[PDB]
Every structure is written in C-alpha cells, then in structure tokens.
Amino acid sequence: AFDFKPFAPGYAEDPFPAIERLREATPIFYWDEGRSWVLTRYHDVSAVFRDERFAVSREEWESSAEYSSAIPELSDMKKYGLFGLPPEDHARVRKLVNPSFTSRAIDLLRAEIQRTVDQLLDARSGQEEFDVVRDYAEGIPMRAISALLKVPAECDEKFRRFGSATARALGVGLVPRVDEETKTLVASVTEGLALLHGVLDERRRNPLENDVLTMLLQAEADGSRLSTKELVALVGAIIAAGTDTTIYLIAFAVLNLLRSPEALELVKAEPGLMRNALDEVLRFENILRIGTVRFARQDLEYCGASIKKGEMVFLLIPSALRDGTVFSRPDVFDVRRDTSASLAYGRGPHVCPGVSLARLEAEIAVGTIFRRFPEMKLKETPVFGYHPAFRNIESLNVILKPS
Ligand code: HEM
Ligand SMILES: C/C1=C/C[C@@H](/C(C)=C/c2csc(C)n2)OC(=O)C[C@H](O)C(C)(C)C(=O)[C@H](C)[C@@H](O)[C@@H](C)CCC1
C-alpha cells in the first residue's frame, strides 16, 4: 500500500516504476490526498467498469454537495451530462448519439482532417524547431470535432480553450490539484458555453441534412427523447472530452515511435499496422495520470477492503495496462501484439463514444508526419506538466529533415 504521489515531478514522464511497486504490493490502497480507494490490477479494474454496485454519477459521492457547488457555471453539465445522468437516462442519450460516432459515420471527416494536417505541416515545417504538440497535435482535434459539428475554423481556438478549460474545471473539488487559476478557467468555460448556445441556435434556424447537431435538435423537439439541458451538456462534453485526450494520443504516438526505431520501421513496412500501434501506444503508455473514478453505491468488501457507500474509487489505468498476468512482456512497446484487452477507451455503458474519431485523427496525423518526414528525430527530452487527469506533454521538439 506504499507511496502514491502522482503529482511528484518525474511521475508524468515515467510513472511505471512507482505504480508497479504499488501494483505488485497490493490490489487496493487508500490515497489520502485523493480521498479515495485506488485499484491497481487489470481484473479488478475491468470488473468495476461493469459492476453496477459502483456508480459514475458524482451525485453518489459522499462529497457531492461540495462538488456541485464548485464551478456553478458547470452545474448543468454535471447534472445532465453523461457522467451525472441516471443509468436509464444515460442509455437513452447514448442510444441517440452513438450512431453518429461509428467508424463509417466519422469516415466523412477524413478529407478535412488531412487538409488540417497538411496546412499545419506546410505552415511550420520550414524552420529549425518543430514542436509536435504546439505546432501540430494542438491544432488537430478541435478542427475534427468542429467539422463533425459543422462549425467554422474561425471558432476553433475558442472551442479548444473551452474544451481544455472545461476538462480541468470539472476536476475542481473532485481531484486534488487542478493546475490553473479559477478565474481564467471560469472565463473560458463561460465564453465557450456562450459560443455553444449561438452554434446551436444557428443550427435550429438553419438545420442541415445528415448532421449530428440537427439530429440531436430534432430529437429534443419531438416527444421526450433528449432535453435541452441533456443536449447542451452532451455537446459540451464531447468538446471537452475530445480535445486534450487526442492531443496527447497523437503526441505520445510520435514520441513512442521515435523511441522505438524497430516499431517505426515495422509501421513503415506495413502501414496497415498503424492502427494497432496507436492502440498499443495507449496500452503501453497510457495518457492518464491516475485513471477514472467510480463511487460505491453501498458498503461492501473488495480486494480486502471495507469500502463505504459514497466512497470514491480510482481505477489506475496505466497500471492495470502493464499487468503482466494479462499482457505478455507488459513493459515492451510491441505494435504487433493483441491489444484487444486494452481498457484505454473504457468498458461498459460509458465506453468512449469518440474512439473511432480519435483513431482516425491519430492515424492521419501520425501516418502523415512519418510518411512525409521519415527521418524525423527527437531534438530533446519531452517536457511534461501537472494536468490533474493527464500525463500532459507540453512540448515535443523534433527535427523533421536532420542535416
Ligand atoms: C484517445 C483519446 C480518448 C481516450 C483515451 C478516451 C477515453 C475515455 C474513457 C476511458 C472513457 C470512459 C471513462 C469512464 O468510464 O469513467 C471515455 C468516455 C468518454 N469519451 Fe473518450 N476518450 C478519448 C477520446 C475522445 C474523443 C475524441 C471524444 C469525442 C467525443 C470522446 C468523448 C468521450 C465522452 C463524451 C465520454 C463519456 C461517455 C459516457 O460517459 O457515456 N473521447 N473516454
Ligand atoms: C479520457 C477521459 C476523458 C473524458 C473527459 C470528460 C470531462 C468527460 C465527460 C463526460 S460528461 C463530463 C462532465 N465529462 O474528462 C477529463 O478530461 C478530466 C476530468 O474532467 C477530471 C474530472 C479532471 C478527471 O481527473 C477525471 C477523474 C478523468 O481522469 C476521467 C473521468 C478520465 C477518463 C475519461
């Protein structure tokens, strides 16, 4: 049950020695600063995802009151968003939007994503320094979500800001060390919600064929299928959930291929392996700092612990995914392995709706960059930060065509 310090300097860069220590010594421990139990092993993590004794709604938490008062601008999003809705409401909302996120539906986005990837590399690949985060990955995910929502590129920076702020603001009162000023967070959240109201009112005015937002609006207008608050919360969550995560995937992919020349040469030789490799990036080195949370609906015993009702539980994803009893050679980056058991996109009713979008964006972004600059080399050690949810890479400086 030893030493868990996920905000220590060095942890985001390389958390694996620390959490192997934890995982090898115990399946469960109490994280005093996080005020919650932490589960360290694959099977325990996997099960809790599907186990209905554990809720997602933060309203089940013993500290619900404190959490709901924090960032009142986000109260609606917390009550009516995908995490807060009761299971039958959650199923309903998911049944509605899931069709818009399949591989086939998101395939339409392919040309716009490639165009964005093309102009980012055109506009900045000429200087000495190329920052894979600042100059590349950062400009991609919002373009994608905005194409899916049919929002003009001029609004991209406002929504990205909103997405990233919202993801952090939702941590305030929930997770220990949100690394930003409230007033700044709150302003980006406010402005973003305003922008969103305008996007939605325009779409109701000018509804479109084969369009996610119009479909959601048309469901809201007809007999009870989606409330206005559910709808707004849903679009807001999609923007916030899909912004930073994908930035980190793309960056961690490039990093991990630069670090493993063998893996890269394999993906060069069989471009069809790119999809598996991107899944193995998340498996071998998951972008999450700690993981995700659940809340005990009732007192119960679990892996030798007496968990009380309302107590929070963290699933230590990056640990579970190095669990040697499920993955062979868990500590090797192997782009040929079977990655089916990866929990990186969740399991159960709350399984990530954006998985096909994240994979498409990253295949295009990571594929393109290595095809057009095959001899790319890391110019320096990646700089990591203190995002409360993510092992966030702030910069990843490389040399595209090295002398
Ligand atoms: C590689 C990037 C991504 C990762 C690793 C990821 C991971 C996850 C995970 C693990 C969950 C479940 C969390 C839990 O059960 O507590 C989830 C839920 C979610 N993800 Fe993703 N996601 C990613 C990208 C995206 C994108 C691009 C979108 C765009 C819409 C998205 C939208 C969502 C939403 C809305 C939920 C809530 C689902 C629900 O509660 O029903 N994600 N994601
Ligand atoms: C990868 C990941 C992204 C989901 C995204 C988010 C805010 C989703 C969502 C749906 S409805 C709603 C209000 N939000 O959530 C995030 O990007 C970060 C979370 O907002 C905060 C609350 C900061 C966290 O640390 C949590 C515990 C985070 O690590 C878990 C939830 C991450 C796995 C899911």
Swiss-Prot record:
UniProt xrefs under InterPro entries: Cyt_P450, Cyt_P450_B, Cyt_P450_sf
Pathway involvement of the protein, from the record = Secondary metabolite biosynthesis; epothilone biosynthesis
Which residues does the annotation say bind substrate?
167, 291
- Protein keywords: Heme, Iron, Metal-binding, Monooxygenase, Oxidoreductase
Q: Which cofactor does it need?
A: heme
Record-listed E.C. numbers: 1.14.15.-
Record function comment = Involved in the biosynthesis of epothilones, macrolactones which have a narrow anti-fungal spectrum and microtubule-stabilizing activity. Catalyzes the epoxidation of epothilones C and D to epothilones A and B, respectively.
Name the Gene Ontology biological process terms. Answer: epothilone biosynthetic process
**What is the source species?**
Sorangium cellulosum
- Please indicate if the UniProt record lists RNA-binding as a keyword: no
Question: Which reaction is the catalytic activity of this chain?
Answer: epothilone C + 2 reduced [2Fe-2S]-[ferredoxin] + O2 + 2 H(+) = epothilone A + 2 oxidized [2Fe-2S]-[ferredoxin] + H2O; epothilone D + 2 reduced [2Fe-2S]-[ferredoxin] + O2 + 2 H(+) = epothilone B + 2 oxidized [2Fe-2S]-[ferredoxin] + H2O
Q: Could you say which residues bind heme here?
A: 352
Name of the gene:
cyp167A1
Q: Which Gene3D superfamilies match?
A: Cytochrome P450
Q: What is this protein called?
A: Epothilone C/D epoxidase
Q: Which family does it belong to?
A: Belongs to the cytochrome P450 family.
User: What GO MF annotations does this protein's record show?
Assistant: heme binding; iron ion binding; monooxygenase activity; oxidoreductase activity, acting on paired donors, with incorporation or reduction of molecular oxygen
